[PDB]
Design a protein around this ligand. Structure first.
Ligand SMILES: CN1CCN(S(=O)(=O)c2cc(F)c(F)cc2-c2ccc3nc(N)nc(C(=O)N4Cc5ccccc5C4)c3c2)CC1
Length: 207
């Protein structure tokens, strides 16, 4: 288990998301589904030249899994996945650029719902989650588990758990007052409203 400090801008963006009074918290799902969709597009392009990149899983889909018992909402994709370098260095660097542009926009009065245009949409997860665990598997690396409860740090460990094949699993440990995002009707309403035109099948799992 390795612990890393987020870069100053990301930590600032994260605490902005957690501290700003903003009622329209549902936008998080759209951001995670759109990230999954883009990840699925990346493995689909890579498969045009090198077809062996789909030996880790041919099916390209998105699964939404609520668990009332564990109070979690999981967003699963069979997209490209992420390497140790992606989790530790690359994610932080690609975000850094978009993070500053977004915080500048909100001052000037933009609103949180515009987070995705700045490529930092993933962090909107902290509108509803007290902790986020990300399980990922890329073709050129091992299975990793990234984790953060914000507070300026994140952890990275090798995942000894159930193999994934290829893709990303975003486990949202929901805040006590955000259990509505475990409800079938609510998820369906959000997916129909924000993600009705995703070019991959989205399966809402039930309990
Ligand atoms: C949104 N697209 C997806 C495709 N790419 S990519 O080119 O494949 C890439 C290049 C990188 F250099 C890199 F570091 C990561 C990724 C990467 C790959 C697959 C992904 N799958 C999901 N589902 N999500 C994210 C994500 O955006 N996350 C998860 C995650 C985990 C922890 C912190 C931030 C975040 C934000 C992913 C990112 C670009 C971004």
């Amino acid at each position: 288990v390795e612990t890393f400090a987020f870069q100053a801008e990301i930590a600032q963006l994260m605490s902005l998301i957690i501290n700003t009074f903003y009622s329209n918290k549902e936008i998080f799902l759209r951001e995670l589904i759109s990230n999954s969709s883009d990840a699925l597009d990346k493995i689909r392009y890579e498969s045009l030249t090198d077809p062996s990149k789909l030996d880790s899983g041919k099916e390209l889909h998105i699964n939404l899994i609520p668990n009332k018992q564990d109070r979690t909402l999981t967003i699963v994709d069979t997209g490209i996945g992420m390497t140790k370098a992606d989790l530790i260095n690359n994610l932080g660097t690609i975000a850094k650029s978009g993070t500053k542009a977004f915080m500048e926009a909100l001052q000037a009065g933009a609103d949180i719902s515009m987070i995705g245009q700045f490529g930092v949409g993933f962090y909107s997860a902290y509108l509803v989650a007290e902790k986020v665990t990300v399980i990922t598997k890329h073709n050129d690396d091992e299975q990793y588990a990234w984790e953060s409860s914000a507070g300026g740090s994140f952890t990275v460990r090798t995942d000894t758990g159930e193999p994934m094949g290829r893709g990303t699993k975003v486990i949202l440990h929901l805040k006590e007052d955000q259990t509505e995002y475990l409800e079938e009707r609510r998820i369906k309403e959000i997916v129909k409203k924000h993600s009705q035109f995703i070019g991959y099948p989205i399966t809402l799992f039930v309990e």
